[PDB]
Design a protein around this nucleic acid. Structure first.
Ligand SMILES: CO[C@H]1C[C@H](O[C@H]2[C@H](C)[C@@H](O[C@@H]3O[C@H](C)C[C@H](N(C)C)[C@H]3OC(C)=O)[C@@H](C)C[C@@]3(CO3)C(=O)[C@H](C)[C@@H](OC(C)=O)[C@@H](C)[C@@H](C)OC(=O)[C@@H]2C)O[C@@H](C)[C@@H]1OC(C)=O
Ligand SMILES: [Cl-]
Ligand SMILES: [Cl-]
Ligand SMILES: [Cl-]
Ligand SMILES: [Cl-]
Ligand SMILES: [Cl-]
Ligand SMILES: [Cl-]
Ligand SMILES: [Cl-]
Ligand SMILES: [K+]
Ligand SMILES: [Mg+2]
Ligand SMILES: [Mg+2]
Ligand SMILES: [Mg+2]
Ligand SMILES: [Mg+2]
Ligand SMILES: [Mg+2]
Ligand SMILES: [Mg+2]
Ligand SMILES: [Mg+2]
Ligand SMILES: [Mg+2]
Ligand SMILES: [Mg+2]
Ligand SMILES: [Mg+2]
Ligand SMILES: [Mg+2]
Ligand SMILES: [Mg+2]
Ligand SMILES: [Mg+2]
Ligand SMILES: [Mg+2]
Ligand SMILES: [Mg+2]
Ligand SMILES: [Mg+2]
Ligand SMILES: [Mg+2]
Ligand SMILES: [Mg+2]
Ligand SMILES: [Mg+2]
Ligand SMILES: [Mg+2]
Ligand SMILES: [Mg+2]
Ligand SMILES: [Mg+2]
Ligand code: NA
Ligand code: NA
Ligand code: NA
Ligand code: NA
Ligand code: NA
Ligand code: NA
Ligand code: NA
Ligand code: NA
Ligand code: NA
Ligand code: NA
Ligand code: NA
Ligand code: NA
Ligand code: NA
Ligand code: NA
Ligand code: NA
Ligand code: NA
Ligand code: NA
Ligand code: NA
Ligand code: NA
Ligand code: NA
Ligand code: NA
Ligand code: NA
Ligand code: NA
Ligand code: NA
Ligand code: NA
Ligand code: NA
Ligand SMILES: [Sr+2]
Ligand SMILES: [Sr+2]
Ligand SMILES: [Sr+2]
Ligand SMILES: [Sr+2]
Ligand SMILES: [Sr+2]
Ligand SMILES: [Sr+2]
Ligand SMILES: [Sr+2]
Ligand SMILES: [Sr+2]
Ligand SMILES: [Sr+2]
Ligand SMILES: [Sr+2]
Ligand SMILES: [Sr+2]
Ligand SMILES: [Sr+2]
Ligand SMILES: [Sr+2]
Ligand SMILES: [Sr+2]
Ligand SMILES: [Sr+2]
Ligand SMILES: [Sr+2]
Ligand SMILES: [Sr+2]
Ligand SMILES: [Sr+2]
Ligand SMILES: [Sr+2]
Ligand SMILES: [Sr+2]
Ligand SMILES: [Sr+2]
Ligand SMILES: [Sr+2]
Ligand SMILES: [Sr+2]
Ligand SMILES: [Sr+2]
Ligand SMILES: [Sr+2]
Ligand SMILES: [Sr+2]
Ligand SMILES: [Sr+2]
Ligand SMILES: [Sr+2]
Ligand SMILES: [Sr+2]
Ligand SMILES: [Sr+2]
Lengths: 142, 160, 172, 337
RNA sequence: ACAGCUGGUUCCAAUCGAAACAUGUCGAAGCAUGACCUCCGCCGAGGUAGUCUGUGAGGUAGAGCGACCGAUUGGUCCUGUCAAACUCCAAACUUACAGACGCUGUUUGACGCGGGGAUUCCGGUGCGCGGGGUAAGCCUGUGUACCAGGAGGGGAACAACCCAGAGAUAGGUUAAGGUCCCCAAGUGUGGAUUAAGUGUAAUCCUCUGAAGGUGGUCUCGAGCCCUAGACAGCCGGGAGGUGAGCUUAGAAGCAGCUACCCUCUAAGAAAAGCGUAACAGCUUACCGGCCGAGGUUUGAGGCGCCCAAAAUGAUCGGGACUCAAAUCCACCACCGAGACCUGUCCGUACCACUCAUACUGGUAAUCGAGUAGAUUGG
RNA sequence: CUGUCCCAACGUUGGGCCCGGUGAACUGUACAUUCCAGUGCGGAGUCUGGAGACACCCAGGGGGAAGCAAAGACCCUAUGGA
RNA sequence: CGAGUGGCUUGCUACCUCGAUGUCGGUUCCCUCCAUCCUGCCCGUGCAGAAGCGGGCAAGGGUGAGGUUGUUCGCCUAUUAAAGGAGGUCGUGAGCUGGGUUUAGACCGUCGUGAGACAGGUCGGCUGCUAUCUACUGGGUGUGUAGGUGUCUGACAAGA
RNA sequence: CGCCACACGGGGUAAGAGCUGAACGCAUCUAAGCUCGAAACCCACUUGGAAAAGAGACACCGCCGAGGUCCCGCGUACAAG
């Protein structure tokens, strides 16, 4: 429900970490970013291990807790939080001025950032965030 | 006892028997194997087992590797085959063990070891062209019972 | 490298993205041919599998893609046929094709019927103690034929004494 | 070597705190099979009596013989489905769209709700149909209340409002079925949803037992032998090891017991009827007399007398329904004696 | 009461600045005397932390032993190994004295001498070399630098690892280290490798991973065969004398013994492997055909993989990273200390002037960190 | 012989909880909402990294503060004592 | 013979605490590890079958009752699918118990001239504290979200 | 100590059994691809859960009045609340 975004980024076929690193740098530069099509975002490597790293993060916890998101919505949001000093005033403002969305709820198509796109024709060892979330046990709502 | 207690060359050279008493005899039977009457120059093929790291090999390991090497040569070439193998290293370094805590720590004599430098020949077998793959297998079994990684270097083998 | 495959007169093959569709008188086979830097294209009369890389891994798949396309040609013309024989030593095994699945009844004395589902456009025909698995996609036929052999799998007892089951007689 | 033993009590019904709503809320609903219908009803617990039955089970060696079965009597008067709520499929789960209400309201519904005076049942209905056209319509549920006024033994006149799901045929046909019930007056009985012999899931908020200790709450042991006389009788050994330097939430502690929502699975409906056939002599202890629409549910049901219990067709039944069991005798003997 | 034992001992600043060692001690939780720190007076021109050369001292490393000595192989000279308490040899290096250059001293008086006051004699770590010990964040030596008593920068945190020795203030450039985000600076360039999330971990109690194994993959060399058609696969042939002889009831490619010959021919064993009681039956050698381009053998290197099991919640600091944000080879530009350069000021020391230690002017690349402690102004 | 136990239940009396009145002590370097790891004189709420965490209050049983309490009563040492 | 993993035993070392970090065993209650005893799915067999033997994946659940002994350990019995092992300050004394080790009393044996000793045995021999902080179990009051009533959604969380 | 209730099935995997298949004309379960396959995992089911700071949704009532609190009679509730 309405977010006055300055920049709208398209995560489709883009390497998650590389996008997140730029979305962080821009959030700290006062830009209001919005990451779009995060279900279709990419992460490279052997699926089997990538899933194990995320499945462990779900199983980790205690009474204090460790809230790790299962949906590709929150997974991207947490990755961005990882590149920002979110406990500081300047960092919380930056993080809160960044929102991840499933699909594209805007009118405009998002821009693909430089050096973030993965050439599917050149790569076979990767995963879609939606694939990770389906394995984690999340409800497919995209 | 494990070889980890005696494999390194960090201790001084302790060999002088005129000051060391109660040294246990070598478990090694013989250094000259096969047809010890024939010459080493009478063979077209000379293959040596070369030690890659600088270690100390105990008499028990020297014997265990020699036994499982010569036993294969006796199995494949017979008890009187046309070969001759030599174990050129002798167990000169005397080994101790502190077996009272760390007081009067200098241990009692428990055995003997052979200081072999890297690149040195531990074993050297002389054979005929046809028996070459049998001796390469005698050494593959022998290098499995010592401490370092090894090389099977053919010194007189243009026949391949 | 580049391996050019001439398409037979009986066949016509269309391609979009990474998916190749091969149509002929015996049917239609669609497969996905995806591997890094390998391009599979239609030159109207020939199918071209090419890459800029000549390493062992890439070379392995260029050869696999060839034998896949060659197999799709033979599938849409002559077809693929696997032959099987049902053997029993004490209990009369009632093999039947019921719906889209081949059902085996009273195997080794069981009250419960053993059943496996048929993969795609594969046809299983029964003529007594002989079964013939046939179709255009080798992936489908090969597996349906295998599924049948694997349906009479016995782990609990000796295979040498309890030899009952349907077995592959003819491999194409 | 210290013998093994399962932990005291289940961690699945946690946290063991007081229920938010005294009226139970189902979190699961049945699958869409046959003809469209309301997936649940409700009543008010009356008490227990036994019934004699003829064994229905084909696999029982006692098939056809006399058999005594414990049964709980629940007064189930007709409920009113006052509205049709519609949900839409959003990227954030299901969200309510609009609601279709009515004109006919029960005399005392204003004791709970702020009854609608001005509503557009047509524009609401239109939004639902334009959403079905778009392929965004999720499920179809009805807002429903009870008539506690119809039950003389229950003090309350204030209706217990709760939402129930309508499943069945196509989403288009069950939209029609749903609107059709509402447009009238929303009146429906247990005969409309259930048939005697079927397996139902009964939800309820348990008997409130206030604050109780570990022995009652978690079923831990009492201190045994010599330990029992030392000053510690009903307290556990320890609150955990040295490390971790904290008390885990898994260690049995004191607190609230009862007044928890429980959904008891696979409850057989022995009989559905009307009148005074199941009433006990001298009236049901701490309840009253039964004369009207009821339901006889096999065994126990969560909650005390006078409490509202909810019904739903079993989401996971074990046995196949053996409809309309033969009732040879229902006991009317006093519960005092 | 006495105690060699625990605790405490109150204001500011400036100069120098340790010892945790040696000899003796009913001595080892203490002292004394030396080493070493500081202060004063004296003497009066040399001094020697570095280097080179010259004149001397030396037997550790290495090596070797028909060179002594003593261990320690086998054969019918030859052949196989060793040494803290061996030496026919023999360094690097350390060391005496002297000369030379350097540096230093003659108003800052060095070198030295005499006297006053100490503190100190539980040390620790890194590196090199050690001796003991299975090992140790072990014990005990030695040389050295460091912590102790050393800030600041880096290393996630962290006495001794890297940079760096530091008056105040200010501008600038760098060092170690770093440049995808967190986080200042590159999602830098040319080329290659790795697919394991290997790795993104200098050093380490701290960061493991071994013997053994690997048609995972990349690179490099050697030999041999190949359009007179190789390697493989598929087809056809694999035959006669004779079922060799002997053995044996039988043995006929194939139980065993010996031999292992010659015809046909393009090949085809007195048969390499199964198989039969023995035959038969199935391929092997060997020849031909189809086919059509490299194939086969071995050596070496690179990265990875297997080997690989632990207790509350997984980790390179975290995120997360795959033609990299990994690894290796080159290269480009930057970020980054109190270091280095630079403006002013302060303290201290010395010089000129002076009664002045009052001013004024000057010099310091060769002054400015400090626990115990000596000295001095407030 | 029996609630010692299987295996716990219900009850009685006084407390406990709420209200009026009365009214101490122990303890206190400071800061303090923690948790999982790591590091550190090798047994950290405070260091480092992450995670979690809106404030205040009532009741509880005591997991941690190597909890509070007593200059270890073991062991060694003192040119100690009886 | 050779290479290692673990950190349950024992030994070594003497880094931490002697202005005190309560013992062994047991008990109670909680979490965990896998090198798996049972259960699930597998492979081999000297796999006819039945009953086994060996190995693989696998830690969800289970692994119990008793006789001697303070015992841990261990021995023994009958049951059982099986009656696995180990970590948590050898988990757990501001929870219990106090049978053993290890005070002061006493006996026996051995040793000693003797006081008295013993890594010998034996009988008797004490268990403190009103919870400030933190932690968790349950219960409230406020503030934020920015008028109310009723119905819901589901990020995540728990389960054997 | 009594009585009632407490699945099945899907999806993806491990060990494993296979299919198609190349490097390496053959062969090969694996290198790309695919079919199966554990009491284990995910879903299913139960419980909690608008303080989820993106601090949510719907319907209706009300903003001079909707609704709530105190009050009174009581418990399907309860140590205060
Ligand atoms: C271990 O046995 C204890 C038993 C008892 O424990 C004490 C009391 C607890 C003791 O505390 C414990 O003492 C041990 C010697 C050491 C132990 N620490 C190692 C932990 C210490 O703490 C413990 C054991 O928890 C006691 C000394 C406490 C204290 C303050 O010093 C003390 O003296 C007070 C005036 C106590 O009186 C006496 C005679 O002890 C009183 C407070 C009473 C009421 O409390 C007690 O008596 C408790 C029963 O008496 C001690 C002297 C024993 O010590 C030994 C070695 O046997
Ligand atoms: Cl958690
Ligand atoms: Cl932060
Ligand atoms: Cl790839
Ligand atoms: Cl108890
Ligand atoms: Cl300095
Ligand atoms: Cl990873
Ligand atoms: Cl002054
Ligand atoms: K202590
Ligand atoms: Mg069997
Ligand atoms: Mg009664
Ligand atoms: Mg009665
Ligand atoms: Mg001063
Ligand atoms: Mg001054
Ligand atoms: Mg030497
Ligand atoms: Mg000091
Ligand atoms: Mg930056
Ligand atoms: Mg790693
Ligand atoms: Mg304590
Ligand atoms: Mg003391
Ligand atoms: Mg004493
Ligand atoms: Mg005395
Ligand atoms: Mg295992
Ligand atoms: Mg478990
Ligand atoms: Mg007992
Ligand atoms: Mg303990
Ligand atoms: Mg405790
Ligand atoms: Mg207490
Ligand atoms: Mg006793
Ligand atoms: Mg006793
Ligand atoms: Mg006590
Ligand atoms: Na990645
Ligand atoms: Na989590
Ligand atoms: Na001794
Ligand atoms: Na008590
Ligand atoms: Na404790
Ligand atoms: Na004295
Ligand atoms: Na001394
Ligand atoms: Na002393
Ligand atoms: Na040397
Ligand atoms: Na000079
Ligand atoms: Na000293
Ligand atoms: Na220094
Ligand atoms: Na630092
Ligand atoms: Na990694
Ligand atoms: Na000083
Ligand atoms: Na009693
Ligand atoms: Na506590
Ligand atoms: Na180890
Ligand atoms: Na130990
Ligand atoms: Na105990
Ligand atoms: Na298990
Ligand atoms: Na016992
Ligand atoms: Na302890
Ligand atoms: Na106690
Ligand atoms: Na105890
Ligand atoms: Na499954
Ligand atoms: Sr950037
Ligand atoms: Sr050494
Ligand atoms: Sr000792
Ligand atoms: Sr070896
Ligand atoms: Sr235990
Ligand atoms: Sr509901
Ligand atoms: Sr729910
Ligand atoms: Sr007691
Ligand atoms: Sr702790
Ligand atoms: Sr010297
Ligand atoms: Sr780059
Ligand atoms: Sr590059
Ligand atoms: Sr450590
Ligand atoms: Sr290392
Ligand atoms: Sr190796
Ligand atoms: Sr494992
Ligand atoms: Sr200064
Ligand atoms: Sr100074
Ligand atoms: Sr309390
Ligand atoms: Sr005392
Ligand atoms: Sr098993
Ligand atoms: Sr007993
Ligand atoms: Sr023990
Ligand atoms: Sr014993
Ligand atoms: Sr006792
Ligand atoms: Sr004793
Ligand atoms: Sr005893
Ligand atoms: Sr606020
Ligand atoms: Sr497999
Ligand atoms: Sr809210």
């Amino acid at each position: 429900a309405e977010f006055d975004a300055d920049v709208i980024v398209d995560a489709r076929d883009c390497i998650m970490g590389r996008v997140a690193s730029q979305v962080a740098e821009q959030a700290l530069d006062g830009e209001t970013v919005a990451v779009v099509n995060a279900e279709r975002a990419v992460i490279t490597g052997r699926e089997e291990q990538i899933v194990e790293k995320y499945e462990k993060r779900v199983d980790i916890g205690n009474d204090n807790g460790y809230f790790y998101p299962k949906r590709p919505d929150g997974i991207f949001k947490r990755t961005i939080r990882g590149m920002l000093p979110h406990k500081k005033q300047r960092g919380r403002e930056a993080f809160e001025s960044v929102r991840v969305y499933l699909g594209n709820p805007y009118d405009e198509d998002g821009e693909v950032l430089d050096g973030t796109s993965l050439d599917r024709l050149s790569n076979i060892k990767f995963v879609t965030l939606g694939e990770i979330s389906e394995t984690l046990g999340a409800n497919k709502t995209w | 006892k494990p070889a980890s207690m005696y494999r390194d060359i960090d201790k001084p050279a302790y060999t002088r028997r005129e000051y060391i008493t109660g040294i246990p005899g070598s478990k090694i039977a013989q250094h000259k194997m096969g047809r010890k009457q024939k010459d080493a120059d009478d063979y077209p093929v000379q293959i040596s087992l070369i030690v890659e790291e600088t270690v100390q090999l105990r008499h028990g390991s020297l014997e265990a590797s020699r036994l499982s090497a010569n036993r294969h040569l006796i199995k494949e070439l017979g008890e009187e085959g046309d070969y001759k193998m030599t174990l050129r290293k002798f167990p000169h370094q005397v080994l101790r063990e502190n077996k009272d805590g760390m007081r009067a720590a200098f241990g009692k004599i428990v055995g003997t070891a052979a200081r072999v430098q890297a690149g040195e020949q531990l074993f050297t077998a002389y054979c005929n062209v046809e028996d070459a793959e049998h001796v390469k297998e005698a050494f593959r079994r022998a290098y499995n019972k010592i401490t370092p990684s090894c090389r099977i270097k053919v010194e007189r083998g243009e026949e391949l | 490298p580049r391996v050019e495959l001439e398409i037979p007169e009986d066949v016509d093959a269309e391609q979009d993205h990474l998916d190749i569709t091969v149509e002929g008188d015996n049917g239609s086979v669609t497969r996905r041919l995806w591997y890094p830097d390998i391009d599979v294209s239609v030159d109207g009369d020939t199918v071209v599998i090419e890459s800029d890389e000549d390493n062992a891994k890439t070379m392995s798949t260029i050869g696999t893609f060839q034998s896949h396309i060659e197999n799709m040609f033979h599938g849409v013309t002559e077809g693929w046929e696997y032959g099987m024989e049902v053997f029993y030593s004490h209990f009369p095994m009632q093999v039947n094709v019921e719906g889209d699945e081949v059902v085996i009844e009273n195997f080794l004395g069981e009250k419960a019927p053993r059943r496996t589902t048929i993969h795609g456009d594969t046809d299983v025909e029964i003529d007594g103690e002989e079964l013939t698995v046939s179709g255009p996609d080798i992936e489908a036929v090969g597996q349906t034929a295998a599924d049948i052999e694997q349906l009479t799998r016995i782990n609990d007892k000796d295979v040498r004494v309890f030899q009952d089951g349907v077995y592959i007689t003819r491999k194409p | 070597p210290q013998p093994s033993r399962p932990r005291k009590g289940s961690l699945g019904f946690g946290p063991r705190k007081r229920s938010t709503s005294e009226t139970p809320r189902f979190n699961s609903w049945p699958s869409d099979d046959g003809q469209p219908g309301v997936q649940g009803f409700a009543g008010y617990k009356a008490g227990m009596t036994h019934v004699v039955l003829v064994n229905d089970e084909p696999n029982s060696p006692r098939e056809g013989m006399e058999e005594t079965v414990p049964v709980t009597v629940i007064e189930t008067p007709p409920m009113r489905a006052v509205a049709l709520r519609a949900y839409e499929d959003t990227p954030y789960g299901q969200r309510p769209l609009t609601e279709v209400w009515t004109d006919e309201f029960h005399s005392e519904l204003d004791r709970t709700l702020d009854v609608p005076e001005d509503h557009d049942p047509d524009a609401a209905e239109e939004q639902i149909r334009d959403a079905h056209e778009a392929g965004d319509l999720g499920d179809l549920r009805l807002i429903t209340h009870t008539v506690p006024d119809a039950v003389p033994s229950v003090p309350k006149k204030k209706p217990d409002v709760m939402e129930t799901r309508v499943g069945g045929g196509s989403v288009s046909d069950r939209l029609d079925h749903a609107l059709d019930i509402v447009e009238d007056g929303g009146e429906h009985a247990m005969n409309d949803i259930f048939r005697a012999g079927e397996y139902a899931d009964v939800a309820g908020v348990t008997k409130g037992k206030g604050t109780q200790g570990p022995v009652k709450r978690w079923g831990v042991q009492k201190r045994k032998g010599k330990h029992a006389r030392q000053g510690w009788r009903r307290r556990i050994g320890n609150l955990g090891p040295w490390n971790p330097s904290r008390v885990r939430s898994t260690v049995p502690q004191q607190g609230q017991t009862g007044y928890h929502q429980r959904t008891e699975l696979n409850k057989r409906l022995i009989d559905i009827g009307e009148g005074d056939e199941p009433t006990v002599d001298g009236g049901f202890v701490n309840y009253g007399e039964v004369d009207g629409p009821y339901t006889l549910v096999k065994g126990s049901v969560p909650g005390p007398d006078k409490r509202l219990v909810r019904f739903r067709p079993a989401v996971r039944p074990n046995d196949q329904p053996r409809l309309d069991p033969e009732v040879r005798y229902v006991s009317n003997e006093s519960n005092q004696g």
